[PDB]
Design a protein around this ligand. Structure first.
Ligand SMILES: *CCC(=O)N[C@@H]1CN(c2nc(Nc3cn(C)nc3OC)c3ncn(C(C)C)c3n2)C[C@H]1F
Length: 280
């Protein structure tokens, strides 16, 4: 995987898919010059650094090549930065499980858990701390295949950095590990905490964590030992994996490699681990 530099004439925006503080995502078509091939893509236009700095960040970004992480295919630099990326036709996994909650079985849910863990393990191997893992930031290529993406919070650790020490940026409190809330510290193991919350979202078909509770009260609730409740469909074996992800000692938590193994085992006999009516 290498970085392509695109001219505006190469791609076109078809429609908005969503937006936020990061910018706007469009469904689009990319036609590389003279290649006569039309590629469906997602165009992320961000809301300045030197062009060479931006291209260097895009270079490392384009080298991320894994079945469960969304890839950067090209970049266009004009008055705005436009990142051309793989299109995930079914949108964010959060909305998907909410829409299809009545028709999703244990096999799909556990497979998604495996896939997200595989993508995160790949990021860890690349020394990337994601810092924003949540069901809204996992996207659906097909019902059977999901991919993680990033909207700016991910950070690359230096050779001798074991943690990222954050500054004043806005934080997704309800997905964060306690040490991140209290001390602005982020590691692969705080990503594991967020993975646990993401799995809880999936198993509750996209329910809201700490629903109706002010973000400002979350650290105190966590310090008292309280955690998100066991989802109705979860056998205790699955819930205990979540609970391990939310242990106060980051080194107590499973690593993504461990999570791949455990969820893969469960995925072999899915109805033994998630209890879903009509499944199957
Ligand atoms: C629940 C989170 C959410 O809605 N986030 C929006 C959507 N988004 C995004 N969407 C798609 N594809 C998509 C979404 N919908 C409704 N239809 C489609 O495609 C037909 C993406 N494909 C790729 N990416 C990123 C890698 C850029 C997508 N991002 C992010 C946010 F705007």
């Amino acid at each position: 995987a290498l970085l392509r530099i695109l001219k505006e004439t190469e791609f076109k925006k078809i429609k908005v898919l969503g937006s936020g503080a990061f910018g706007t995502v469009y469904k689009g078509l990319w036609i590389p010059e003279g290649e006569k091939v039309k590629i469906p893509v997602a165009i992320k236009e961000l809301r300045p650094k030197a062009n060479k700095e931006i291209l260097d960040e895009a270079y490392v970004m384009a080298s991320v090549d894994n079945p469960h992480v969304c890839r950067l295919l090209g970049i266009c630099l004009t008055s705005t930065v436009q990142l051309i990326m793989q299109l995930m036709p079914f949108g964010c996994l959060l909305d998907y499980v909410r829409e299809h909650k009545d028709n999703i079985g244990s096999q799909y849910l556990l497979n998604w858990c495996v896939q997200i863990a595989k993508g995160m393990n790949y990021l860890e191997d690349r020394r990337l701390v994601h810092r924003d893992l949540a069901a809204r930031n996992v996207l659906v290529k097909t019902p059977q295949h999901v991919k993680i993406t990033d909207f700016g919070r991910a950070k690359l650790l230096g050779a001798e950095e074991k943690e990222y020490h954050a500054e004043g940026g806005k934080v997704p409190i309800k997905w964060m590990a306690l040490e991140s809330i209290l001390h602005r510290i982020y590691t692969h193991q705080s990503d594991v905490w967020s993975y646990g919350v993401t799995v809880w979202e999936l198993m509750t078909f996209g329910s809201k964590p700490y629903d109706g509770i002010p973000a400002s009260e979350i650290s105190s609730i966590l310090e008292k030992g309280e955690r998100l409740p066991q989802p109705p469909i979860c056998t205790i074996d699955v819930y205990m994996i979540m609970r391990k992800c939310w242990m106060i000692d980051a080194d107590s938590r499973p690593k993504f490699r461990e999570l791949i193994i455990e969820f893969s085992k469960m995925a072999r006999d899915p109805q033994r681990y998630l209890v879903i009516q009509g499944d199957e």
